[PDB]
Ligand binder design. Sequence first.
Ligand SMILES: CC(=O)N[C@@H]1[C@@H](O)[C@H](O)[C@@H](CO)O[C@@H]1O
Ligand SMILES: [Cl-]
Ligand SMILES: [Cl-]
Ligand SMILES: [Cl-]
Ligand SMILES: [Cl-]
Ligand code: NA
Length: 129
Amino acid sequence: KVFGRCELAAAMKRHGLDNYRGYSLGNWVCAAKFESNFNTQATNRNTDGSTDYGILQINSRWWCNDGRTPGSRNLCNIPCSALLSSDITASVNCAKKIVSDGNGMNAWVAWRNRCKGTDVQAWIRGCRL
Ligand SMILES: CC(=O)N[C@@H]1[C@@H](O)[C@H](O)[C@@H](CO)O[C@@H]1O
Ligand SMILES: [Cl-]
Ligand SMILES: [Cl-]
Ligand SMILES: [Cl-]
Ligand SMILES: [Cl-]
Ligand code: NA
């Protein structure tokens, strides 16, 4: 599923991502835009053999299990395919644990390089929330 800008913002707000650990809703929509282009089925191969999955490109090296990343962790206790669903519930709940381990949203490289320090509210402007 390819989310719309306002459609994803409302789904993220309903799942409690607005101001979660001090990160306004514009940060999560901006991150999902530059990580997956609002595509829930987006996957990308990392150089170390791990794979990023879903709307937020959650890596399999730590958070999910895909069966081919040897020596990795499954900290979110989910199959990585559950992150590719049109229901972003699994990706949201796992992102809440990732953003809470100390580094915040810096765990998403796209957010650090393309959203951090910018006007993130412009990603939710004009949306019925
Ligand atoms: C929280 C999370 O899984 N972040 C990943 C990270 O593993 C990696 O640096 C990158 C790979 O392209 O994409 C995402 O930012
Ligand atoms: Cl915002
Ligand atoms: Cl594995
Ligand atoms: Cl949803
Ligand atoms: Cl933080
Ligand atoms: Na894993």
